[PDB]
Design a binder for these strands. Structure first.
Lengths: 237, 128, 236, 125
RNA sequence: UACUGUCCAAUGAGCGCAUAGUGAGGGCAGUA
RNA sequence: UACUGUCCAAUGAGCGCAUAGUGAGGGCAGUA
């Protein structure tokens, strides 16, 4: 009916993935155009946001890795020692003001994207739990907004067999779709995934239907199915 | 006590005597390979417009997990009826588990044509 | 260039085009002639034999008994049958325009036909020099087909049977030139998939044998076909 | 008994064995493709380490193409006197006339393979 | 394969790559 | 599952359709 809220969230959800891509790429750009000085650091901390965050501080002068305050609060202290040793055993040269200026500038970018990212996820997870509360409980805010994006809204999403629902937005890996790459599935031993998907797929089809008619608004059915699923995951190792 | 109180949304709900005829029919159509068992599987036969009728169990908890179906037999103008026991129904389709939805697929030159015929009329009768 | 094979592959193609034409003509001549002698269509079912006849008897149906030329084409049975059924013809004569056209179309069929054969004689007479052992298994024709799309007997020999089997598929899924060959075709349809695999397999062997112009007088090829023929006679 | 001349290079009764328990070893490791067909596939795809063939396979030519794909991407290859043996070696009830050892990054066989690669070179011109 | 015990199962068991692809044991009979 | 007998099998056993598709039993343990 005109502008239906779901659409607004689907599109909203999408900017997050756009930003994953954008960050993923900014990651690669910084670790690269920085691996000129401290080329080793890359391999030391493999975590994007942290890395990007650190390299903004570290910067042009790399002495004093120990006892800095944000270098401290952004990093585990067990891994702040292992730098000062490979910081003295420096492996690269200082940077021009034109090569740094574009590194600092592309960090502020990284973080400012990251902010915007979370604060979009916050929006989607919220409104999603009002739109379709049970579906959400199982697979998650976003993934649920994705299956819905393409299904074209909770109504149709509902009238779909689980087999089809399972394959939503698939083309990397054959017959694996939004739910396969979901969070709740990927967090498993890879031999367990082709099964887990159909299990989750099918329960989602139940939630989806239950949400279609607006029952279990508090989220009951959702929580139940999510448990019946997690539990089967243990029995399964 | 009368268990005669089932979720009202489960409409129409077969007369005991009717309920027999379906299970019986369903049991046969299972043997003539004119039967599909399943929530999902029934939904398919609806869209592909090859179901004569839909039988659903009011047992079905939460009930909404199959309420999407009645709204679909409206579209495709297919008779649909609820029987009382998902468990009773499973056993009819020949399944050790409960079955909350089944469909009797269409098929040409099948002896159960007039049987299905009747069943259909009898369901029509309560939807009206 | 000057790729000998490419010509053979190319020529073999006419033969199927001519084969297609002949078909059209037949269907045409059967169509027009049925105004003069309807029932004939079904006494002579054979495309070529049916033409040769309408060319022979033509407008005068009576000239078909005692007929020297006819007797060299049709069994006494069929001849004596067309002869009796043609005193009960059930269809009128033909106007010059209608007859000259149909007679002219016959002459065509036959000229095509007999030229198609002079083409086949070439394709075999060559296919057995470029790839003798191959030809003996599948058919000089079908051989030259897959060889055509493989682009050479050498590139053919550098292929997995699995692939060769698939050469020339777009009907049925993953049926290629081998599946439609004569050998694969001349059996009960369930036995045809196991049969395609087999033949593809054994051709990948002959192909390789012939990429080294060994067994040129044709040895390997015959033995191979034998092994294959018995594996068939076994299956029923 | 002497083998057909085309069989070349042909491995010492020593090289023979060294090869066949490499092949066995690379079999329980996922790095083995067995069969003249599958053999060719991998040559084509540039992911072969070496080729082993079976100079008693008649007609010989039925594998002699493999040598010519070893020239496109330079890849080694050898002929062991018997295929029945090379079949036991690949883990099969039937004869095997060729086989190919896959390329896989970080394989503990990595050393024991190059050991063979370099061993065949010394056989060739 | 039969039987027994347990778990899971139509509220879905099991399947799901590449077709110029795949790549190992399989069919039939009898016995348990 | 296992045993026997036999026929096939890298010189290729078995696969080959649908993927907005499929649609029934299954896993594991004990016994023969």
């Amino acid at each position: 009916e005109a502008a239906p809220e779901y659409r607004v969230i689907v599109d909203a959800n999408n900017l997050t993935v756009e930003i994953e891509n954008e960050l993923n790429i900014i990651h690669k750009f910084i670790r690269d155009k920085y691996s000129k000085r401290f080329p080793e650091l890359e391999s030391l901390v493999p975590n994007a946001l942290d890395y990007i965050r650190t390299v903004k501080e570290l910067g042009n002068s790399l002495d004093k890795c120990k006892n800095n305050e944000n270098l401290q609060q952004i990093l585990t202290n067990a891994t702040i020692m292992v730098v000062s040793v490979t910081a003295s055993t420096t492996q690269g040269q200082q940077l021009s003001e034109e090569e740094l200026e574009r590194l600092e500038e592309a960090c502020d970018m990284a973080l400012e994207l990251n902010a915007s990212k979370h604060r979009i996820y916050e929006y989607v997870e919220s409104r999603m739990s009002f739109i379709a509360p049970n579906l959400s409980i199982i697979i998650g805010a976003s993934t649920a907004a994705k299956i819905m994006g393409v299904a074209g809204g909770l109504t149709n999403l509902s009238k779909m067999p689980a087999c089809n629902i399972m394959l939503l937005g698939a083309q990397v890996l054959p017959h694996t779709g939004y739910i396969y790459h979901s969070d709740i599935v990927q967090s498993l031993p890879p031999d367990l995934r082709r099964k887990a998907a159909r299990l989750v797929a099918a329960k989602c089809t139940l939630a989806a239907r239950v949400d279609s008619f607006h029952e279990s608004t508090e989220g009951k059915v959702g929580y139940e199915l999510k448990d019946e699923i997690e539990r089967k995951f243990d029995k399964w190792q | 006590m009368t268990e005669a109180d089932v979720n009202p949304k489960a409409y129409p709900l077969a007369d005991a005597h009717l309920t027999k005829k379906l299970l019986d029919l369903v049991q046969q159509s299972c043997n003539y390979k004119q039967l599909r068992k399943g929530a999902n599987e029934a939904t398919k036969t609806l869209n592909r417009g090859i179901s004569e009728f839909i039988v659903m169990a009011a047992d079905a908890e939460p009930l909404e997990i199959i309420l999407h179906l009645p709204l679909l037999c409206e579209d495709k103008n297919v008779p649909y009826v609820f029987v009382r026991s998902k468990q009773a129904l499973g056993r009819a389709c020949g399944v050790s588990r409960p079955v909350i939805a089944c469909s009797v697929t269409i098929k040409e030159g099948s002896q159960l044509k007039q049987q299905i015929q009747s069943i259909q009329q009898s369901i029509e009768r309560l939807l009206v």
